[PDB]
Design a protein that fits this description.
This protein has a single domain (1-76), classed as DNA Binding (I), subunit A (Orthogonal Bundle). Helix content is 66%, strand content 0%. It has helices at 9-24, 30-42, 46-66. It binds a DNA duplex through α1 and α2. It is found in: Nucleus. This is Transcription factor SOX-9. Residues 3-71 bind DNA. It comes from Mus musculus.
Length: 76
Amino acid sequence: PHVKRPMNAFMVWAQAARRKLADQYPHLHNAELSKTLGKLWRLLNESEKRPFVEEAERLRVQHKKDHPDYKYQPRR
DNA sequence: AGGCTTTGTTCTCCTG
DNA sequence: AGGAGAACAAAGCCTG
């Protein structure tokens, strides 16, 4: 068994945004989508980012509670 | 199976 | 010393 990383603010926000974007732009692939998502992300300010920042932090805390002895060991 | 693409978090290396 | 560099979370498509 090999766990995986908790989502950060950007990833949490991109779940529902990618979706809405893919609707609007069916002809686009996730590569291109991601570029548009980037710009849309940095277009937000503190207040607009806060809920996802908070959401990434509770997700983060939960990950530690779920996996106490976890340690991130990326591959080479 | 793994690349393409993004941000943010966390890892593994270390020269002068 | 701390930071450059890269992995890896999400998505779904798509050759040989």
